[PDB]
């Protein structure tokens, strides 16, 4: 089994539990669901208009994070080239289903 624990050879005494930053910052970080609702950059575009009701851009809506568009070799989207993928697909990489 994965999280089985046979022979604990602890040396530690009792560490004071801050309650995930409650006792210092006045706020909790135990639940990752309420961190998930901090807004994250999803995708960024540059309009290249090539009627009134023509859809200017479409995107599938998904919490997985999009297929990441760095850009061409000349003008990379400097966050998506440098700072990869952010938080929400870094957590969604740790799961398999979602419903919400």
Partner 1 sequence: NPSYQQSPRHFVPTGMHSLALGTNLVEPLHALRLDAAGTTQHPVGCAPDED
Partner 2 sequence: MDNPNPGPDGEGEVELEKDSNVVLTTQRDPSTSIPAPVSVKWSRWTSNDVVDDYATITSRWYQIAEFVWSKDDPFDKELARLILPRALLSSIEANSDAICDVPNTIPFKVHAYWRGDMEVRVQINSNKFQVGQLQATWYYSDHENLNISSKRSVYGFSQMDHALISASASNEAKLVIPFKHVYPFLPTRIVPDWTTGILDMGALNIRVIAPLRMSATGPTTCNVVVFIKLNNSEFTGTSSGKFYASQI
Partner 3 sequence: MTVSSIASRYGLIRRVQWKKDHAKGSLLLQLDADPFVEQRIEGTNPISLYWFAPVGVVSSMFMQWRGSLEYRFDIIASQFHTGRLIVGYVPGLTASLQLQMDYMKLKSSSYVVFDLQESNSFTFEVPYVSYRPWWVRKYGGNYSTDAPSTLFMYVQVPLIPMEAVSDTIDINVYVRGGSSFEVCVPVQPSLGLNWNTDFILR
Question: 7-46 mask for partner 2 (x: CB under 8 A)?
Answer: x-xxxxxxxx-x----------------------------
* Number of Cβ within a 10 Å radius of residue 89: 17
Out of 28, 30, 45, 69, the only residue in the binding site for its own copies (CB under 8 A) is: 45
Nearest one of 38, 25, 20 to 91, comparing CA atoms? 38
Question: 9-48 mask for partner 1 (x: CB under 8 A)?
Answer: -------------xxxxxxxx----xx-xx----------
Provide the β-strand partners of residue 92: none
Out of 33, 72, 73, 74, the only residue in the binding site for its own copies (CB under 8 A) is: 33
Tokens of 20: 């995930």
Q: Are 1 and 10 in contact (CB under 8 A)?
A: no
């Amino acid at each position: 089994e994965e999280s089985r624990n046979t022979t604990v050879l602890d040396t530690t005494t009792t560490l004071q539990s801050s309650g995930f930053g409650r006792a210092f910052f006045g706020e909790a970080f135990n639940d990752l669901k309420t961190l998930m609702r901090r807004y994250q950059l999803y995708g960024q575009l540059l309009l290249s208009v090539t009627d009134i009701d023509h859809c200017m851009f479409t995107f599938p809506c998904l919490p997985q994070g999009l297929a990441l568009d760095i850009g061409s070799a000349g003008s990379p989207h400097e966050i998506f080239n440098r700072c990869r993928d952010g938080i929400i697909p870094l957590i969604a990489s740790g799961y398999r289903f979602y419903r919400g």
